[PDB]
Amino acid sequence: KGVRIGPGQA
Amino acid sequence: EVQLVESGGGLVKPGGSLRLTCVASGFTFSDVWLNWVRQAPGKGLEWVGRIKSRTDGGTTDYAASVKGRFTISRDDSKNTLYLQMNSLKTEDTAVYSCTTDGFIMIRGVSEDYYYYYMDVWGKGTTVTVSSASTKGPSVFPLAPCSRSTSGGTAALGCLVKDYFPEPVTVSWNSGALTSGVHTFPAVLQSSGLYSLSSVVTVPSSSLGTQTYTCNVNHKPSNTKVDKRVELKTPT
Amino acid sequence: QSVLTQPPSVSAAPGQKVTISCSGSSSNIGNNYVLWYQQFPGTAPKLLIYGNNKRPSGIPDRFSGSKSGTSATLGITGLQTGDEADYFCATWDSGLSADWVFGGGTKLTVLSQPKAAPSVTLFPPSSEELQANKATLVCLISDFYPGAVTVAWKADSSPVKAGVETTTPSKQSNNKYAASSYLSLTPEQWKSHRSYSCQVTHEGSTVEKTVAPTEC
DSSP: OEEESSOOHH | EEEEEOOOEEETTTTTOOOEEEEESSOOOSSOOOOEEEOTTTOEEEEEEEOOOOGGGOOEEOOTBTTTTTEEEEGGGGGGEEEOOOOOOOOEEEEEEEEEEEEEEEEEESSSSEEEEEEEEEEEEEEEEESOOOOOOOEEEEEEEEOOOOEEEEEEEEEEEEEBOOOOOEEGGGBBBBBTTOOOOOEEESSSEEEEEEEEEEGGGGTSSSEEEEEEEEEGGGGEEEEEOOOOOOO | OOSOOOSEEEEEOOOEEEEEEEEOIIIIIIIIEEEEEOOOSSOOOOEEBBBBOOOOOOOOOTTEEEEEEEEEEEEEOOOOOGGOOOEEEEOOOSTTTTOOOOOOOOOEOOOSSBBBOEEEEEEEHHHHHHHHEEEEEEEEEEESSSOOOOOEEEEETTTEEETEEOOOOEEESSSSSSOOOOEEEEEHHHHHSOOEEEEEETTTTTEEEEEEETTT
């Protein structure tokens, strides 16, 4: 899990 | 001891190819995404492309300005990142650096948030795409348009044009003159050649009392030029 | 020419405050999160702000960030001479390649000496160069502080951009700054105008120099 904040992220 | 070191930069003719290497150390290479960025002299940073980690697919993304000409690849077993450049253009000239995507993790009351950013940066390797080659400079005298008038100061100098590569050294009167001397950093022309100026400030009412000769040395081409600069004497 | 636009430079005295703007579009700043970096000469960029306004551990609350619409801002209060450095914003594009994109960078000068206007000297092309079928006007700019100026050329009082090459500013031995600008013309063009000017703008004030073909 976990939120990805950045380019080309989930 | 976290670091990235790139190598492979050099002079290349337009239409040529060059491969850059970036060696990582101090961290688990295979776990991170990597980027190639570049910065042309006097301009802003520009992202070249990325390559994801094996776990995220190991796929690549390229800036519109290089897609189709540049290829990025990684070798996790060697902790090495590569940038294969083909069909090079003069506008590809710049300092190329590799970077990793790192993150700041935040533990929320529910989910963990990962904020990514370019974390580790290499010092870069320089790539010069130009048809230029070793050339000595042409030296021209710099004298004021309007005749100098007594009282105050006058500026005179030498324009050191079209040389390559850097550097060039300038002294006046064989080094006997340093007071009021100011040699400026060179400007880079579209042709790939440099030019710079060196000027000396002197008392206007003193013109005619002595001579001023600039001694230009361009070691790369083993060229030396001594040029006397003559200004019109105040009336 | 940078994707994100930042003022070239900003300055203030110790203990004061400054803000550094970063302008973009909906496709970058507008849809995503802004980062700010601090960079010292010969050193890798250091993360100052992430997620628009979050500070990594180690960065004191004097540093703050905010985002509004398609622009972002970096605020720095209680200026320390140690803050003199370059600052640039960054985020990513919403395009097909999700490019990391950057601002051109802003040089922050923490005033440590009185402001000094530039000394400007404009040289015309020499007779020797003209006989080599070339013409270069040379504008030398020195002793200014802070280290940022903008150069504009004029021919017959009309703007000229073509054939102009201006160097970045560089620190002099005495800690003030120098820069130069060159206007290249053919000998024929050179003789066609009545006057040429090199105008240097520094901290709102403009210093100008002119030469006239007939007089040289």
